[PDB]
User: Fold this.
Amino acid sequence: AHAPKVIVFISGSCLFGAISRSLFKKLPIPYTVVLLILGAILGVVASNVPLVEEHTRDVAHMDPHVLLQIFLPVLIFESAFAMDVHTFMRSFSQVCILALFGLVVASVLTAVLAMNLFNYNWNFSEAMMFGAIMSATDPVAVVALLKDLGASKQLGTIIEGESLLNDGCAIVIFNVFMKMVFFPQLTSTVGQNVLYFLQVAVAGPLWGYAVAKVTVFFLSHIFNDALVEITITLAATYLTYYIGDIWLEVSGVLAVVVLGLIVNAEKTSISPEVEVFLHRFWEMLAYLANTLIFMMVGVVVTQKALVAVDKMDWFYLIILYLAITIIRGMVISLFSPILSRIGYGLTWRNAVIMTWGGLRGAVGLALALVVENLAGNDVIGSKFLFHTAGIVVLTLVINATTIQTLLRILGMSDISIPKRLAMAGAVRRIHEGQNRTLNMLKSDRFLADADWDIATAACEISDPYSSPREFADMMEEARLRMLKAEKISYWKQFEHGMLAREALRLLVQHAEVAADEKDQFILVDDLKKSWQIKGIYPWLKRKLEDLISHHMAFEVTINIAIVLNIVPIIMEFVVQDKMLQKIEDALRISNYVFFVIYAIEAIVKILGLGRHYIVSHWNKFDAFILVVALVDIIIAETSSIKVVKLFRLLRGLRMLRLTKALIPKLILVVNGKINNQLSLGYDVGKGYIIGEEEVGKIIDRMVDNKKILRELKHISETGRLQVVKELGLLQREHPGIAVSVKTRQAIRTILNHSRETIHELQGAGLLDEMEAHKLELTVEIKMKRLMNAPSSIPPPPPENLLKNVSWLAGDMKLIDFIKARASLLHFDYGEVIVREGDESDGLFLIVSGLVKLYGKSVFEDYLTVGNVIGEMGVLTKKPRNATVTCETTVQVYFITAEDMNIAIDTFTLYPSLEYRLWRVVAIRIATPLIMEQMAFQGWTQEKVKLHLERGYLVDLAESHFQFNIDATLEDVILINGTAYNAHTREEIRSPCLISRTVHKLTFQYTATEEPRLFVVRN
Amino acid sequence: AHAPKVIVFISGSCLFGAISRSLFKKLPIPYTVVLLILGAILGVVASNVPLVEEHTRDVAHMDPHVLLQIFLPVLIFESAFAMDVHTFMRSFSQVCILALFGLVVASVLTAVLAMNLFNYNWNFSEAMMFGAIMSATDPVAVVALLKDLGASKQLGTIIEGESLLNDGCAIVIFNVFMKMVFFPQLTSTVGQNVLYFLQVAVAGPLWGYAVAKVTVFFLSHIFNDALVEITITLAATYLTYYIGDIWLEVSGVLAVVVLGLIVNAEKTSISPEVEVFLHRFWEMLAYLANTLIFMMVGVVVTQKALVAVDKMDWFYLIILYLAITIIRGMVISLFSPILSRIGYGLTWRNAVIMTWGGLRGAVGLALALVVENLAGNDVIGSKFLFHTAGIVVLTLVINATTIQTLLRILGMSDISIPKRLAMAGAVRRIHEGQNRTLNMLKSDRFLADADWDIATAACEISDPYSSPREFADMMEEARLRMLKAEKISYWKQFEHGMLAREALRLLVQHAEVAADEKDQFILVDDLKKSWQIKGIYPWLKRKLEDLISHHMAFEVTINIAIVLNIVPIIMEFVVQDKMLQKIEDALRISNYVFFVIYAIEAIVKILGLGRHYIVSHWNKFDAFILVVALVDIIIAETSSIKVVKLFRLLRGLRMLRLTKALIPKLILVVNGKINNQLSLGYDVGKGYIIGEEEVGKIIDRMVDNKKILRELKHISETGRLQVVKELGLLQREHPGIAVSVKTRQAIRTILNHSRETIHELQGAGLLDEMEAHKLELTVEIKMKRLMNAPSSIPPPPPENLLKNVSWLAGDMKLIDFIKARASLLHFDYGEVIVREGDESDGLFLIVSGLVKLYGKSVFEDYLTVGNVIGEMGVLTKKPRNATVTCETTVQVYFITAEDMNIAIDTFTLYPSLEYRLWRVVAIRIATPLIMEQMAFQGWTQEKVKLHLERGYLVDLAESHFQFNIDATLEDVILINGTAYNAHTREEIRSPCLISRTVHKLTFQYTATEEPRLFVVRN
Assistant:
């Protein structure tokens, strides 16, 4: 059979690709040129040696179908799949203008040249096929350099996206003109041509979109089956192309492009193992396709093409190379007035790279082989193949090698001083670690006599990269140094999962954009562009909710019944539109019986709802459709004008009333869009707030100048406050979406720490490897089920807020008491709930709204639902520390200090209510104190809070003296009250970090300021 | 074209497999039965609806070639690839006996039944095809249960290996009898039949072995190219099959089996990413093959088979099911007298599982489809397909579901108390961690109002599994508790890379075997089976080294010349054996010119070496071959008997002398085999020593009974000492191999810690993600280059040992001094180098041999090259602490205390020589002290040593008082000398762990016992 033999030839191609790719890794020329050389050699061998000709001929040629329907889909999908979708969408308008118009203009100009330069006397359709071939690109070799050098990352994204769209549209143009040349048909009317344009250009992406959304839907519902996900992705990728191109005659390649982009975007719905597998799998297929195409080009160019090449063809080829380079540069320059004003903009030297980086590749060669096959004996196939191969070789030899020197000359290969210094520091760190390990290993019993001259050489890692004027100098130093601290903070937040990858990239992009620009800091108005939702979706949401504003089984039954009955309707009316004696009778009978049994909705609803049945708007349509069907059924017991109008009405009216059930789902879709935008804005805002709170502890130990310190601290806080206000406003604008976004991240954090506990048990050897996977898989299934959480969650009632406060969360009997003794208060904008210095009246738990707080230790921040205000008012029993003002309509539970005192004095079990309240206060006191001692040591706020979570209040009043052992402790904070050192007799009367040299403490009955102390176990 | 359509059908199969696999996950029946049902439905549809018949018929049938040459290789290779090779090799004799003989006996018995039960009147060849089909297996559904239950892991390995070999040999038997039935040929002679048997049974595995070794060779030389590795593996896998089955007519399937097993074994030569990709890729292909085969079976069984099935065929099918189950059980029982005495043995209930677990699968169905296609219109194809499908369905419905209940009834589904308790503890740990994180999250500003009723329910992980008599009870408790501590230690050593995976599995197997057996502890003689090298390779090594015992370019030129000239020789003599006028003349001329130019070896060597040229043995053959060629060339200037003998001699003599160059490489091969065995033994011994040294610190805090304590401590040390002796002996037996094995692990440890430093910088955000990958890739390329390190490394000279001692390793001027003042001593067995209580004479650095040490703090251990003996003899200047005796011929550098005192008093820079010596002493003192405080806390010895590596000696004598701050320190050990507490005035005169409550220390001029103190920075 032929299939084993083609697999054999594919494996031969595999090994030749391996050889070429391995040996010429040193040399600058890419391996594809070596594959062309090998193809040429194999061609001459198979020509002069018939013993191998008769074997190889059977596989040496490829039908147009295998090219256009296997190779091109693979290449185009792999290109669409490896792309970073988000930056592409960020630059879509620029990349799409450049691709879709530059392709047309470049192909037209190339076709004009091919008619006027070459003596081949081609007509315009042939020249346009030629231009479409010569306009394809393959910059995989250049985007790699732009990624490695790191400079102008947006340029790499733009070039790659342009290549993707350019290749897709080039294939479409080729498919048109190939038909006009090799499969001519009679002149179609303008209307049919317009429909054909819409079929290829508009139906394609829409078909891809539909299949992509269906595929991601199903992928979101598969668990513990990597094979099913992989298989579904592959089957969808091929069926999209085949059904599009063959059955629908819709542009398959564009649908495949859209499918790749969408599936890449929705990567969160795919388990990570399947993600990495799919990336490597499509890379492998693209590699095989490239090797096969290049070797086939060499073989057939020696066998069939070069036998008909004249001395003038080489001159034409050189002129063509110059012409296409000039055309591409001219196109880019001509659109520069537009591209400069959209997306990323376009620097001159970026335009130079984009011109020079236009490598041609496998797509053009595959199209040239299609032409060569279809042309048969005509010279046009040989001319096409020769010129395409010549251009490919010239670009891969000249451009693909000189691109590096061009990057150097234009001044872009220079790696920035920041990154160079970071690399040098990291290398020295690694080197010191190696030195330590070398010493230990030398000081060991078993490996004492290893040849260290070999080992030390073997491990050596080496560097890969090798007064007011003074006040402005120091200011620019501090500016860049602070932005570096912000970058570090954003990465640290990412690694623990406080940040989504997209939020991280947004923040890092804003930080590097702020670094290169003069006198700049991260602009809060550039962050606001995230959570400021575009009004389209809110508009739609309120509209649909307005539009949607008797047992449960009835509507389920009727909604099923519509789907059931539409099949008879369409079956009959399509037949009547197209044009068994029992079948038409059976269809009419089915219509009549359906109309009869529709009493179970019509009259049942009329009687159940009573006279007011018609008040509900949709029941009016329910009556109307029955009225129409009654007449058009009664007619049967009594012409063209009857039937051709009934076939309109009895279809149209029956499908319409399904929208009543459809709207609730579109509401969910709008909610999902709003949820995604709100979640991204929330993540970036929270990340920025935390980054400012962390960098605002580092700067006090990192700039000396006590004027630059104040200016940077002011810029930091004036940025922070706007965000903390706006995030509070977002909740009020869209409550339930925010509630869902909060619950989701809560679960995510819990699951991450559960995985870390599992890995700790695994590394400690307390849990088997096979048991570790079994637990981890449940962790992952829960994590994936997070993606299917409702996009909106109903906000909890206030009693559920009381039920969940950290200190209330315990005894049901205490919760019942607090229900029995509480009051609910409501306040308007600008009402001030708390003043400084007033005596304690009770505790406030805010259940709605946003409040601003102010007071000297200043403290200008805000609080929101679930926060408790006046925490120690009944513990310390002293004048208020701060003022609280309503920034919004605010609702709180107020429980009087008289109400507290009873429970305070009565709930005295070992998990004491006073103990719980003081611990809630102590964590808040302790966190800044721990940070001020460790922010430069590298911990984040959340690890600080988890570290303090293990701690407990010191059980004083057993006796008023204590000293501790570090074998049972690791940190101490004095929260409140008066204490004094047992050795030095120095008093401590402040919230203080108890330094680790403080040996022994003693206390006394300063009854107004009684002590509390907090300690952490190892 | 046909290829796009077959891809479409494959994608349809993909989606049906996805549906069946997803929906029936709850139900017990496997999805393949659902695929058969779907195939049946599709068959009846395509039968009664010609509109889809005309479309589907083109793909519905499959040629025998696509089955036998695509599907079967894929299935067999995937089976061979997923297998754990090492346990399979450990049980190979048992599994191979059972597979290769049970297959023959079962197929013969089934064929006899098929002749005698069925009225089909088959001949013996047809019945043997039938038996070969019915003897195939597919236990993938049962080995999964045996892996999940964890009981009888060896049984899972045995069943899986039996299936692999059984399927391979069944395909071979089928290929024989299919030829005899459907492609008959004339009766061959017995000799040709014997050659055919050798061609199928012996040449197959050898061809697979050759391709496997070549493939792993090339894979060992590829770096930073995952695609090349993947591509080469796939190309090799298919070319092995194709070249074997088609060009060589050698059994392809067996070669594929051997290739899969070998490539799986050599996984260390493949980058891990390529490993996981290949596993998932072959799983995917096997899944596709299974789905396609089952659906095709359903389609064709409805279209062609069931139309010719009678009421008696069902009775035959049921009788056949019973018969094959009985036959398999009988075979297993009959071989039980043999299988019980080899490999794993065979428990009765294991035999019951193996009988009931014999699921049939895709291989039998594919062979049945081959028969059905070849039979054409004959009833035999329908009978074969019907019976095969019936057996498959019966086994998948009955056996595949009842296997779980059988495992329960026989008493194997019960999970052991140890694992249940471990799971309960791990679950409670995870639950407590979730509780902590829940509390913190509640005590947070941003997520305060998340619906915790949703979150807490969402994250909940749940348990998956739900007096002398008293002295013996306590003894069995301590025995099992110690073995559990050993298991933990072996896992902890693995996670940091002190152990190879195989060494870990050896130790864990020995630990669990020792746990289930009564009154048992890990037997040192079971560890010895690792490093006790079988004598074959040492024998070969010495033999080849004996056999192998004038400018450099000459031999390179001649070794190339032999390879060059053999091509003319073979080209001429094959032609003369087979039977251009210029070509034969040119060949003779080439022979004569080669003989003439061979003067450049013959006479050049004779003159260069002189008269004694003939003394070297190989020069005698060099002269002999020239003598023979001279006569047979001179003949041309003067018949059959001439030519047919010259064609023997002038070939044979020319190839022989290449063995002189070949032997040096075979020496390397033998060295590699010895290296692998020695390395595995070394790893297991070192792991056992460290495990005993760690568990020997835990037991003092883990058993109360001070008699069971002594007995277990004695069993531990008496095991340890034998290993520490034998590992010392191994070095002397095979020096350079041991040196290479030491250097390799040194580099491995350094690279692991370098990777950890990189990940630390990455997590701290100090290094970019893209920079982190760039460094990590260099780390990985170095790690992979470790695999190509020489298998033997020449032992360093003594001056290189002096050059590398931890304290000598510094100033070149000090090294020069030590060269200037040193002495080298040699000692025999039983000479005692050091006695207790003698005055200091100097320091010993051992450069060769093994010495035993003894002394009260007892200390009964050994030391080896690179160890220094008498470390503080010139520091403390007091009577010796211990006795040292030569266990072997021993050589040491002895440098007199008089020689020390000068350098001690002169090398006083900041990196003081005395400082370095005291630090070398201090680490040795400090390590046990840190372990005794932390062994139960979970640290290993190596993390202890790395922790101490950061520490330094306290710079006393600035003033004799000090106190420290934990913000600059983390641990303290007092090494030697006299100190006293500043507050309590208590003296300290012992090597002591300075507990963290010790605030302040003071010292004094007790000149005989001056103090040294060691502290660790954070």
Remarks:
- Chain B has five domains: 2-409, 416-446, 545-662, 798-907, 921-1016.
- Chain B touches chain A through 146 residues (CB under 8 Å).
- Chain B is about 70% helix and 5% strand.
- Residues 291 and 799 of chain B are 68 Å apart (CA to CA).
